Design a protein around this ligand. Structure first.
Ligand SMILES: Nc1nc2c(ncn2[C@@H]2O[C@H](COP(=O)(O)OP(=O)(O)O)[C@@H](O)[C@H]2O)c(=O)[nH]1
Ligand SMILES: [Mg+2]
Length: 162
């Protein structure tokens, strides 16, 4: 079993990405919520099966004292932002630092730009996201939980190198 924690500002798409991967579905009528959740899934890689334990967190500032417990013992950490929201992107550094403080080098980190189906509303370029990821040597991906685009490769890459 490997603990994968999802971090990021409220409403960027953490719950939706997780749902998309778990049941390959999307709630088009889903109106943002506050809460935490745990879900695990087994992925079969051309090397053997890998059990993943996904932690869906609550990123609002009022829950900051819970961050250490979110990240503790994690094998991987996904920092998610919204490509249409500049402020959610500016906060990625904060989340990446929380990860480094708590786990140092013993964790795989991935930076994800979500909501790629709203390209017309993009406020953060792919370039910017990629540079941030390169600054901290993390993985970089842009996804769309709504359309269900480029999400499976994210979990496959994490489950493979970990
Ligand atoms: N257009 C679009 N909306 C999305 C996408 N992912 C999530 N959303 C919507 O954005 C809102 C916030 O998503 P949610 O998963 O609750 O965010 P969380 O706070 O990170 O868990 C919801 O109303 C979702 O339906 C996406 O890829 N595209
Ligand atoms: Mg959520």
């Amino acid at each position: 079993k490997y603990k994968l924690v999802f971090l990021g500002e409220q409403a960027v798409g953490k719950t939706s990405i997780i749902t998309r991967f778990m049941y390959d579905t999307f709630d088009n009528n889903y109106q943002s919520t506050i809460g935490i959740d745990f879900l695990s899934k087994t992925l079969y890689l051309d090397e053997g099966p890998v059990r993943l334990q996904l932690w869906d967190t609550a990123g609002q500032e009022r829950f900051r004292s819970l961050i250490p417990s979110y990240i503790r013992d994690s094998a991987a950490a996904i920092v998610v932002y919204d490509i249409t929201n500049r402020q959610s992107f500016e906060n990625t550094t904060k989340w990446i630092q929380d990860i480094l403080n708590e786990r140092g080098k013993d964790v795989i980190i991935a930076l994800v730009g979500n909501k790629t189906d709203l390209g017309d509303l993009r406020k953060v370029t792919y370039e910017e996201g990629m540079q941030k990821a390169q600054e901290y040597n993390t993985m970089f991906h842009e996804t769309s939980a709504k359309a269900g685009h480029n999400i499976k490769v994210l979990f496959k890459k994490t489950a493979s190198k970990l």
